[PDB]
């Protein structure tokens, strides 16, 4: 047997051993042909009229094996001068097999074409098109930059606030940790501010959900755009101060709606609280230590099959794949969740909201049960995202293997999928969903019921996903509180976002602040992160408390911890477990102070969130929004205003006993001493109970009680 897929697995950042590299070579470029033939004596390629012998021998070694890196054959062809038909011939000891015919046509960049870049006016120069005998594959062009211009945008970015001088792209991808290092993101947008020292600033939005690429050098920003059948790039230009630029973008693509004030309280989470007994124990500990918590997220609550039913629930399977009502279920005294309604009622009685984990995947690995009945219904009734050949797409991912994706691009399937969860909101009164994932769709030719293909639709999937569960909540009369890592243009309108997965390190802390700031510049209002990281050994006391203190000043304050295989000791990120692990007796009392102060801030955050939604001036706000013409702000990229009145300066390094903050024009008050402070550079002591925060003097009368 021998396998060759020209596009391969279509990992956006990597290549599989079975594919053509590159998939679309430039004329003059050689091409690498991989093939997987685990058992073969010899493998040759018939390339045009030639014959090319294949040799014996990015993607992790472990991932590569799964795709058959062992037994992978490859050869480099002569440079492509023209379209070439090719196939492969292989045999085991005199038993031969031949693949089908593949064709590859070389492409070239030209300024000659019927294609247009529309909407950029005099800002756009150097328009070119990547063309082959197949058609026009990509557009490319240049936006003129001036001196002192910064590029801030592109969705959620973990490496830098200002992207000028960097190469980056916009495509939805799950990068597991180290997002800043790799320069990747769960939540890209083809949009950015161009904001500069003197002249009136501006911004642009490339209107596509197809992949886009960015690079800047000198005075030009180069923009490359993947195309569909129509060789047209529609480019929106917005003019004004940064807030007015953002308003233009959000007027076009969508905007947050006011969420309930309770989202501004502390969110508690950890993956290993997998039973009623554990969730109630952890929340009881919060209560007994007098650390206020406003929401609990339960990630493993479910049967771990369909992920729409409480673990150990007892019910008659619906063979037809129809949704269950609440009364279908019995809960056994000895089960993982003997009485989930009683648990939730008690949490609600204490003023704590309950959030349940979700994934947009239907496991195919089971032959029987509700999960198998539903998967079969998905295929039968057309609820699954499809391949080009009409079979259902299978998660080409590494976990939840070969799972189907519900096609959330259309209303009937959003209805069908969410209907299975309806009893969770209507009977159990669940307050929200952590809608995790949504990055799973890989291929250019995938087919969505809304008529889009994968090159267009795959980036939109997490938007549809968030929206679907937002709408479920709405339909039950509740606020659309979804909690998502992944998104794209338009995600602004749906729920809450968190920065995704990271280790517990100062580097991740800094990357996370940048993620929040960049997301906010693009209209993502309610944003948070796992404070001091969820992955690996429990954070040390200093990182945890620096993280906790800054996070009390961020839109969403949340802690979380990764699955540890239920080993001991625990990897919980709870304040008390961190105290226990570190042996540091400052951790609980100081975290409590931060959390208690946080509680007092909820009316401020609520008012400021409302202003952000009304004026588009961001909630977690880079200084360039209010001070575009102050050059000094760019030397302090981790500083921000929380709403109009407060300037925050997170302590991002270990060992710091003092910290310096740059206060822009206007009058300021140090919130810890109530003393006036002059604008400009200010240095103060930073013991663990302090993160530098300054209030606009005119409004200090309103904020003083919070800090009293």
From Swiss-Prot:
Its EC number is 3.2.1.204. It catalyses: cyclobis-(1->3)-alpha-D-isomaltosyl + 2 H2O = 2 isomaltose. Optimum pH is 7.9. One of its GO terms (biological process) is polysaccharide catabolic process. The keyword Acyltransferase does not apply. Keywords: Carbohydrate metabolism, Cytoplasm, Glycosidase, Hydrolase, Polysaccharide degradation. It comes from Kribbella flavida (strain DSM 17836 / JCM 10339 / NBRC 14399). InterPro entries: AIMA-like_N, Gal_mutarotase_sf_dom, Glyco_hydro_31_C, Glyco_hydro_31_N_dom, Glyco_hydro_31_TIM, Glyco_hydro_b, Glycoside_hydrolase_SF, Glycosyl_Hydrolase_31. Substrate binds at residue 566. The active site is at residues 436, 439, 501. It comes from the Bacteria. It is an enzyme of class 3 (hydrolase). Optimum temperature is under 41 degrees Celsius. Its main location: cytoplasm. One of its GO terms (cellular component) is cytoplasm. Gene3D superfamilies: Glycosidases (3.20.20.80), glycosyl hydrolase (family 31) (2.60.40.1760), Golgi alpha-mannosidase II (2.60.40.1180), Immunoglobulins (2.60.40.10). Belongs to the glycosyl hydrolase 31 family. GO terms for molecular function: carbohydrate binding; hydrolase activity, hydrolyzing O-glycosyl compounds. This is 1,3-alpha-isomaltosidase.
């Amino acid at each position: 047997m021998i396998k060759h897929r020209p596009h391969g697995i279509e990992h956006p950042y990597a290549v599989s051993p079975d594919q053509r590299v590159p998939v679309l070579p430039l004329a003059g470029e050689p091409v690498l042909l991989g093939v997987v033939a685990p058992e073969a004596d010899r493998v040759v390629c018939e390339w045009g009229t030639l014959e090319l012998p294949l040799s014996a021998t990015h993607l992790s070694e472990a991932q590569a094996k799964s795709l058959g890196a062992d037994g992978a054959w490859s050869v480099q062809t002569p440079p492509l001068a023209e379209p070439v038909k090719y196939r492969f011939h292989a045999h085991r000891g005199g038993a031969a097999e031949s693949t089908e015919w593949f064709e590859v046509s070389p492409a070239v960049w030209t300024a000659d074409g019927v294609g247009e870049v529309r909407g950029g006016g005099e800002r756009v120069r150097g328009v070119e098109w990547l063309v082959s005998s197949q058609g026009v594959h990509r557009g490319r062009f240049r936006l003129q930059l001036q001196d002192g211009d910064r590029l801030v945008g592109f969705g959620e970015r973990y490496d830098a606030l200002d992207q000028r001088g960097r190469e980056l792209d916009a495509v939805v991808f799950e990068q597991y940790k180290a997002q800043g290092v790799h320069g990747r993101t769960y939540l890209p947008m083809p949009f950015a501010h161009v904001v500069g020292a003197d002249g009136n600033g501006w911004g642009f939005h490339v209107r596509t959900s197809r992949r886009t690429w960015y690079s800047s050098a000198g005075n030009e920003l180069t923009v490359e755009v993947a195309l569909g059948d129509e060789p047209v790039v529609d480019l929106a230009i917005y003019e004004g101060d940064p807030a007015t630029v953002l308003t233009g973008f959000l007027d076009e693509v969508g905007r947050a709606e006011e969420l309930p004030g309770w989202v501004f309280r502390l969110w508690a989470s950890g993956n290993e609280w997998n039973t009623q007994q554990l969730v109630t124990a952890r929340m009881d500990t919060h209560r007994d230590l007098a650390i206020p918590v406003g929401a609990v997220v339960i990630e493993a609550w479910s049967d771990e099959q369909g992920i729409t039913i409480w673990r150990d629930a007892v019910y008659a399977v619906t063979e037809d794949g129809s949704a269950h009502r609440a009364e279908d279920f019995s809960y056994r005294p000895d089960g993982a969740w003997p009485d989930p309604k009683a648990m939730i009622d008690e949490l609600h009685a204490r003023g704590i909201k309950v959030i349940l984990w979700q994934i947009p995947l239907q496991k195919t690995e089971f032959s029987t049960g509700q999960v198998a009945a539903d998967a079969a219904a998905m295929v039968r009734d057309g609820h699954a995202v499809l391949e080009a050949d009409g079979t259902a797409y299978r998660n080409r991912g590494w976990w939840f293997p070969q799972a189907l994706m519900p096609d959330l691009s259309v209303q009937r399937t959003r209805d069908w999928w969410t209907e299975k969860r309806r009893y969770l909101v209507e009977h159990f009164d669940v307050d929200g969903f952590k809608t995790a994932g949504g990055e799973h769709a890989w291929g250019h030719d995938l087919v969505y019921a809304d008529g889009r293909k994968g090159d267009e639709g795959n980036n939109l999937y997490p938007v549809h996903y968030a929206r679907a569960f937002g709408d479920l909540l709405r339909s039950a009369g509740k606020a659309p509180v979804t909690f998502s890592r992944a998104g794209f243009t338009g995600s602004q309108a749906h729920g809450i976002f968190w920065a995704g997965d990271e280790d517990s390190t100062w580097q991740a802390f800094r990357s996370s602040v940048t993620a929040g700031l960049t997301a906010a510049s693009c209209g993502i209002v309610y944003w948070g992160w796992d404070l001091a990281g969820f992955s690996g050994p429990v954070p040390d006391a200093e990182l945890y408390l620096r993280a906790a203190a800054a996070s009390a000043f961020m839109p969403i304050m949340q802690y979380h911890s990764e699955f540890n295989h239920h080993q001991l000791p625990l990897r919980d990120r709870t304040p008390w477990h961190v105290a226990e692990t570190t042996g540091d007796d400052r951790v609980v009392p100081l975290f409590r102070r931060f959390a208690t102060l946080r509680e007092s801030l909820v009316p401020y955050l609520t008012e400021q969130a409302a202003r952000t939604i009304a004026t588009d001036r961001p909630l977690m706000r880079p200084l360039f929004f209010d001070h575009e013409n102050d050059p000094e702000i760019w030397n302090h990229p981790y500083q921000y205003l929380l709403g109009d009145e407060l300037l925050i300066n997170p302590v991002l390094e270990p060992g710091a006993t003092t910290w310096t903050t740059y206060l822009p024009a206007g009058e300021w008050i140090d919130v810890w001493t109530g003393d006036r402070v002059p604008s400009g550079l200010v240095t103060r002591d930073v013991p663990l109970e302090v993160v530098p925060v300054y209030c606009r003097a005119s409004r200090w009368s309103e904020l003083q009680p919070v800090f009293s």
